[PDB]
Structure 1
Amino acid sequence: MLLPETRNLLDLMDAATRGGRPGLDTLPHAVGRKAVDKMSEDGEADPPEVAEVANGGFAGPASEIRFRRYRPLGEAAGLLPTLIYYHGGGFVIGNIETHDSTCRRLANKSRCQVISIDYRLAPEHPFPAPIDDGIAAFRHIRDNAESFGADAARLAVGGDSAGGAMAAVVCQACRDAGETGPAFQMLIYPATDSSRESASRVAFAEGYFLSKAHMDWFWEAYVPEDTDLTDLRLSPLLATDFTGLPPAFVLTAGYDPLRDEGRAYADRLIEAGIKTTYVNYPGTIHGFFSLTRFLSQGLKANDEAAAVMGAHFGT
C-alpha cells in the first residue's frame, strides 16, 4: 500500500531507532522540542526564493505573537490574497522555521502572500492558549489587513495537523462569535475529533505512532485533566451546524490515523452546502506535507493546496 519513498523513509526512521538514542517520550518537552524541531527544519525541501520575507510581532492575548510574511515571486500588487498559516507539531513543537520552506513554496505556487504564525506552545502554555493565539492572529491581521499588505476580501487560514485543527477552529470561532471569518480554509490532514477513536485511529493504535501510547507526551502537555473532550476547540467535527463556514481544501494522507476524521470533516462541509475540495494522497504518511526532503508527494501536495487556494482567489 505504501509508496517506495514512504517505505524508504520509514526504514530510515527504523534505522535511527536502532542507533540507541533515547525516545522522544523520555525527554523533557523543551529538550525534545529543540531536537525534533532541528530534524523538522532539515526534513523540509531546500527553501525556494520568494520576493521578500518579513519578520515582526504584535500583542497577542497574553504575549507577543511573532509572524513571518512571505511575498510570492513575481507578484507586484500592493494588497495580496493572503494565507494565515499555523504550523503543526501537536501544539507542543514546530515553529516558523520548521515549515519555512513549505510556506515559501505555498506563496510562490499560489501567488498568495503567506503569513506563518508563531503561537504559544504546550506544555508551557496548554489548551486553550495555542488556539487563543491562533484566533487572535487572524482577528489582528483581518482588522489590520492593509498593514500586512493583505486583501481583506481574500484572507485564508490554514495549517497542517494541529495547525489544521487550529485553522478549522478559527473559522468556527469567528462564525459562532458573529464576526467576519476567513474567506477560505486550507486543512492539511487536520485533527478534528478528540472525543472518539475512528477506525483509522484504531488501525495505527494497534500500531506504532511513536510506539502507540507516546501520543501522551503531546496530549498530556496540552490538555488539562477533566477538559470536556467534546469541546469544539478540541473536536471541531462535533459542531451542530457547518453552514456559514468558509470554502475549504481538505487533504488526508492514506496511511494516517487522522485520515477518517479529516474526510469526515470534508463530508460535513459538503453536506452543509459549502464549496469543498477534498483530496486523499494514498500510500503516504502523516507529516508528508512538510517532510518534502524525503517525500516528493509532499511537494505535489504543496502545489495542489496552493493551486486550489490561488484558483479560489483568482490569482
Structure 2
Amino acid sequence: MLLPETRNLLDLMDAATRGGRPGLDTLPHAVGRKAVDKMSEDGEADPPEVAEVANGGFAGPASEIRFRRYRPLGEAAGLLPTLIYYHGGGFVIGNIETHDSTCRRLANKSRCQVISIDYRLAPEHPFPAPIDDGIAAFRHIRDNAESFGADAARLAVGGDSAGGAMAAVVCQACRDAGETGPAFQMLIYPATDSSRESASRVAFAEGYFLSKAHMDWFWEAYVPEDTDLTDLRLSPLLATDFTGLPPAFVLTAGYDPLRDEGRAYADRLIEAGIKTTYVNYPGTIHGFFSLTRFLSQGLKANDEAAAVMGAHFGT
C-alpha cells in the first residue's frame, strides 16, 4: 500500500484537520491561495545552489508574464537545452516560489536550464487565460531563445498537475497550429481528461492529499459553467491524433486520482509512435514531486524526470 513516509504525511494532515485547521474547499480562493502557497513553499526540500537565478517578465497576451531562469551548476555553454516549467495548483494556487527548490533540483540534475512561468491564475483569470499564458510563454521563449540563453533546438515544456496539463496542451496547440512545438514534454501527474471519471478518480476521491472536494473548489474557480468538458484544453487525452507530438516523460503516483488518465495519455503517445517514458511511483500521492521536505520519493522523481530529459538532450 502507501509507503511509510506517505502515511506519516497523511497522518500529519489528519492531525491538522482534527486540530481544527479548515478544509481548503471551505475558504475564498484568494484566502486559500495565501495559506496553501506558504505550506507549498515550506513543503519543498531546501533549495540547492544553482549557477545563476534570473528574474524578469515579458509581455503576455493580456498581462506581464513573470519568469525565473535557473542556470545549472557546472554548465558553461551560452545556449543551454531548456525546460519551460509550469507549476501545479489546479490553475488557482502555486507560483514560481512554490516550485523554486524543485526547479533548482531539475536544472542541476538535468544539466538543462529551467524557466519557471508565473501564468495568470483562476478565479481572477478563468479558463482559457492560464493556458493562453502557458502557450504565449513557450512561443515567446521559442522565438527569442538566445535572449533566454536557450538552444532553440532543445526547448522542452513540462509541469506538475495543472502544469502538466498545460505542457500537454502547449504541445497539441503548436502541433494543431502547424508551428514549431517543444522538442520534449515532461508531464508530472498531469490532469488529461475532465470529461470522464477514471477508476482511479473514483477509488481515490478521498483520503489522499488531493480530494474530490479540492478538485471541485479548483474547478468552480477555473471553468465557466457553460464549457464543453471535451474541449482539448481541458481534456487533451481526447485528441483524435497524437502523431507529431514531441517525445515525452509521463509520471504517475500510485494513490493519485489522476493516475489512470496520466497513464492513458502515455498509452496514446506510445501507440502513435512517439518516444515515451512512462513511470509509476506506487505508494505515494499527488503532489509528492514538490512535497520533497516530507516525501524523499519526490527527490527520486525529480532526479528521474531530470535524468531522462538530460539524456534526451545529450547533456
TM-score, length-scaled by structure 1: 0.98
Q: Is the 8 A contact 2:84 2:115 kept in 1?
A: yes
Give, in angstroms, the shift of residue 185 of structure 1.
0.1
Taking a change above 3 Å as real, the CA distance of residues 86 and 12 of structure 1, as seen in their structure-2 partners, is same
Give, in angstroms, the shift of residue 256 of structure 1.
0.5
Tell me how far apart the structure 2 counterparts of residues 206 and 94 of structure 1 sit (CA, whole Å): 22
Give, in angstroms, the shift of residue 154 of structure 1.
0.1
Aligned Cα root-mean-square deviation (Å): 1.0
Tell me how far apart the structure 2 counterparts of residues 210 and 54 of structure 1 sit (CA, whole Å): 32
Residue in structure 2 matched with residue 9 of structure 1 by the alignment: 9
Q: Is the 8 A contact 1:126 1:222 kept in 2?
A: yes
- After TM superposition, the structure 1 stretch with the greater mean CA deviation from structure 2, 27-36 or 240-249, is 27-36
Taking a change above 3 Å as real, the CA distance of residues 285 and 209 of structure 1, as seen in their structure-2 partners, is closer
For the residue of structure 2 that corresponds to 1:297, the secondary structure is: helix
Taking a change above 3 Å as real, the CA distance of residues 41 and 305 of structure 1, as seen in their structure-2 partners, is same
Q: Is the 8 A contact 2:208 2:255 kept in 1?
A: no
Residue in structure 1 matched with residue 287 of structure 2 by the alignment: 287
Q: Is the 8 A contact 2:187 2:250 kept in 1?
A: yes
Tell me how far apart the structure 1 counterparts of residues 84 and 155 of structure 2 sit (CA, whole Å): 7
Instruction: Render the CA deviation track for 1:183-210: whole Å, top value 9, x for unaligned.
Output: 0000000000000000000111265666
Q: How many residues align?
A: 315
Give, in angstroms, the shift of residue 211 of structure 1.
5.7
Instruction: Render the CA deviation track for 1:230-283: whole Å, top value 9, x for unaligned.
Output: 000000000000000000000000011000000000000000000000000010
Unaligned runs of 5+ in 1: none
Moved over 4 A (4+): 206-211
Give, in angstroms, the shift of residue 25 of structure 1.
1.8
Give, in angstroms, the shift of residue 55 of structure 1.
0.1
Give, in angstroms, the shift of residue 33 of structure 1.
0.2
Tell me how far apart the structure 2 counterparts of residues 284 and 214 of structure 1 sit (CA, whole Å): 18
Instruction: Render the CA deviation track for 1:14-68: whole Å, top value 9, x for unaligned.
Output: 0011111222122111111011000000000000000000000000000000000
- After TM superposition, the structure 1 stretch with the greater mean CA deviation from structure 2, 26-35 or 284-293, is 26-35
Tell me how far apart the structure 1 counterparts of residues 90 and 287 of structure 2 sit (CA, whole Å): 11
Q: Is the 8 A contact 2:25 2:213 kept in 1?
A: no
Taking a change above 3 Å as real, the CA distance of residues 209 and 229 of structure 1, as seen in their structure-2 partners, is farther
Taking a change above 3 Å as real, the CA distance of residues 45 and 208 of structure 1, as seen in their structure-2 partners, is closer
Instruction: Render the CA deviation track for 1:268-307: whole Å, top value 9, x for unaligned.
Output: 0000000000000010000000000000000000000000
Taking a change above 3 Å as real, the CA distance of residues 11 and 73 of structure 1, as seen in their structure-2 partners, is same
Unaligned runs of 5+ in 2: none
Q: Is the 8 A contact 1:209 1:215 kept in 2?
A: no
Residue in structure 2 matched with residue 267 of structure 1 by the alignment: 267
For the residue of structure 2 that corresponds to 1:124, the secondary structure is: coil
Give, in angstroms, the shift of residue 214 of structure 1.
3.6
For the residue of structure 1 that corresponds to 2:35, the secondary structure is: helix
| 2:174 maps to 1:170 | no
Q: Is the 8 A contact 2:10 2:209 kept in 1?
A: no
Tell me how far apart the structure 2 counterparts of residues 53 and 99 of structure 1 sit (CA, whole Å): 14
Give, in angstroms, the shift of residue 215 of structure 1.
2.2
Q: Is the 8 A contact 2:208 2:286 kept in 1?
A: no
